[PDB]
Amino acid sequence: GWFHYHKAAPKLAWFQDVESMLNHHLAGLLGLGSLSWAGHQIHVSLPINQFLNAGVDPKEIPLPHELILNRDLLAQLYPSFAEGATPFFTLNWSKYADFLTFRGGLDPVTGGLWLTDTAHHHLAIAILFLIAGHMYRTNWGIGHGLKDILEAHKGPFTGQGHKGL
């Protein structure tokens, strides 16, 4: 905050680049954030919470980094981790049906949503936001113009429509 006002302050045209701002805030802020949180839930929250709901004492639960360095430790709870990322790259996503489930309802053990459901939800949200962030035009000719999109919508009742907004 001190730097971007007292030392290196953006110009007006930097702030008025709404298309690049929307692209970065839909693909880099929401999409990448949801993807990273889905990665945390898949790699950390799911095994730790499985151990907690299994009645294992919290101090005896393996540390979250131990389930990253040891893939077999995560594979005991979810066997699909033994296959690596090849089911993702071969579009055999149904192999990931042990930690990515559309179950719904609540967990009877904890009374909350299934964490696998939240992981799949955040993954799908990340995909949707990432493909929803390549919409608006920038330095390369592909993309949409917000001004043209607004000016293209005008009806008989509204006259000139959304032009000038």
């Binding site: 030392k7 110009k11 980094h65 360095l69 690596g84 990322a85 090849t86 330095n139």
Partner: protein, 221 residues
Amino acid sequence: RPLWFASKQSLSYLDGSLPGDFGFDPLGLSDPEGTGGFIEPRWLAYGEIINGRYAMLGAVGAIAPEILGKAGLIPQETALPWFQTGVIPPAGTYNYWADPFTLFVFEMALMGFAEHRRLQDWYNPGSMGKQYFLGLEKGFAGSGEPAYPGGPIFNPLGFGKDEKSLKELKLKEVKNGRLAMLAILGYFIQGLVTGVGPYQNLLDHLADPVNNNILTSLKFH
């Protein structure tokens, strides 16, 4: 002049003066309009040169102990992959003469000297020949260009006295640097995917090409 993925905006400022210039700037990061902070084109070229030099050191330093251990030159206990030498303690740790944090403090102090001096050359050119520093400041005057200071300390053999030789050597340096940082990124990605070291990856690719590829490594380890 050869151009690789050149742009109309990119050619407006990349005129071939800088070494290793091929017009490649799709994002326009070196645009001289609205320039400030660390986005200055001179600072960007200087950072490219420094990163290239450090990666040319690192791409050989991260693979030499493995090759020497395979060849049996110096003891195999010191011959480890680059992540097994205490850089990443979960990946592996070696018992040196000092604690890794003590070595970090020593490195931080030495490079703080050797790099804040370079930073003050960048801020004020020729400012390190004035203040007394062990009598070595006479070799720290520089030449006005921060990336290529020269002098009896940084250019002792006097390579590239001729201007065309200097330009050719600058082009060679930037090209080998770019290749080396590509190699360092490859080292990092291969460690993330395979986790056996880059020289072991090369040996596995040489032993069989089909079974050991990027395609047959997505299972990770």
